Amino acid sequence: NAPTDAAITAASDFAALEKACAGRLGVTLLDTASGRRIGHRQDERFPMCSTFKSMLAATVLSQAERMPALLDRRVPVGEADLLSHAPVTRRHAGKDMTVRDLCRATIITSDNTAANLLFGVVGGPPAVTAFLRASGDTVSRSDRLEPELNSFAKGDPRDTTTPAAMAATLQRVVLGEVLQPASRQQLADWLIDNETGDACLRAGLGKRWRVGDKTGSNGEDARNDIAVLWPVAGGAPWVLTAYLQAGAISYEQRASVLAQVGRIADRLIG
Numbered sequence: 001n002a003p004t005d006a007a008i009t010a011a012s013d014f015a016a017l018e019k020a021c022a023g024r025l026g027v028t029l030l031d032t033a034s035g036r037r038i039g040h041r042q043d044e045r046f047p048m049c050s051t052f053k054s055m056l057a058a059t060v061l062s063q064a065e066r067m068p069a070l071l072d073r074r075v076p077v078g079e080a081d082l083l084s085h086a087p088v089t090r091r092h093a094g095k096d097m098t099v100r101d102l103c104r105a106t107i108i109t110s111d112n113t114a115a116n117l118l119f120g121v122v123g124g125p126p127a128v129t130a131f132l133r134a135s136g137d138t139v140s141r142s143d144r145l146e147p148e149l150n151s152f153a154k155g156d157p158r159d160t161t162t163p164a165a166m167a168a169t170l171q172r173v174v175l176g177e178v179l180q181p182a183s184r185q186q187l188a189d190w191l192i193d194n195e196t197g198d199a200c201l202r203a204g205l206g207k208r209w210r211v212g213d214k215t216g217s218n219g220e221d222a223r224n225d226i227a228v229l230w231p232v233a234g235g236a237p238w239v240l241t242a243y244l245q246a247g248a249i250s251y252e253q254r255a256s257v258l259a260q261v262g263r264i265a266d267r268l269i270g
């Protein structure tokens, strides 16, 4: 393990980091003031895994803007809805939860049952894709429910994005005008409160950044993290998306790769 870990630590650019883990790494670092992007494989497709949940939540928030009280609607959590990864919803089997609380749960813990219940509320993967298209993202696409959506095959575009498409979408939705201000602020706060990314991009980013993020993974080789970086001292935010497939290293080493993306990105911002 030591040589691979040492090579990951020594990598000072994204191409070298990809080589150090024998993986396929897609990164976009986006300066929201200028639109300038730096990265690696920015326009190749990668499986979203749970990174899509940011946009499922955005779809809910967008629908709530035209459906008064949607966020307060209560949705039953049934035994049949529960999946292996349901850390919040498991305590509510046999009762219900608000749509708003399901959104928070799916963002900050990646709760899979919460996501499937929200898919039922909004009209499924087609409604999330339609939201993405209407927002100006012609690339990202939601196709399946949990847990099937986490599969990937080259040439199979289901449930995929590109680093650059997702970065632009985070800008438009989390920072821009796709949602009303109170909706976008609620979504930003959920991302800021994420609990699953402590070993990923956040571990490589310094204290000058307030970070919101959403992670994803599968059991084969995928580990992802997408983030918005607000400068605590003020100024324009940055967006950092990172998609990795690296089957030759461990799950924990995949986090180390994402942390190194953060370290490289922080130095590139300056």
Ligand SMILES: N[C@H](CCC(=O)O)C(=O)O
Binding pocket: 049, 050, 051, 085, 110, 112, 150, 215, 216, 217, 218
């Ligand atoms: N597929 C994982 C969620 C399920 C799990 O962690 O077991 C993710 O992308 O966050």
